[PDB]
Amino acid sequence: AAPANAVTADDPTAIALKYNQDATKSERVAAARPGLPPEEQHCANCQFMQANVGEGDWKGCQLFPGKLINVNGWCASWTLKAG
């Protein structure tokens, strides 16, 4: 059961970025974003995930203010967590 503030499927930004809560049901391969092979990409290893926001598997994403994403999710703004 997703948190009340989870990013949802008719969120316009989620649609535009092709977010999914489950990276295995994402188009990460098609996008081929740089920094890791696409099968290795998900929110937990993304620069925009906010480790100090949320709880458990439901964490912040800077691009989705006021929302939570799933650490196992993905979107097309995936960028390696570098610092």
- Would you tell me which residues interact with ligand NH4 (CB under 6 A)? 4-6, 8, 27, 50, 53, 60, 62, 65
d(CA 13, CA 52): 22
The annotation status of 43 as a binding-site residue, yes or no, is yes
> Which residues, in sequence order, are CB contacts of 4 under 8 Å at separation 6+?
none
The annotation status of 75 as a binding-site residue, yes or no, is yes
DSSP 45: G
- Asked whether 77 and 47 are in contact (CB, 8 A), the reply is no
Minimum CB–partner distance for residue 43 and ligand SF4 (Å): 3
Considering only residues 46, 54, 58, 67, which one is a binding residue for ligand SF4 as defined by CB under 6 A?
Answer: 46
Binder of residue 6, out of ligand SF4, ligand NH4, none (CB less than 5 to 8 A by kind): ligand NH4
Minimum CB–partner distance for residue 20 and ligand NH4 (Å): 12
Distances (CA, A) of 80 to 30, 46, 83: 17, 5, 9
The annotation status of 69 as a binding-site residue, yes or no, is no
Annotated binding site for [4Fe-4S] cluster: 43, 46, 61, 75
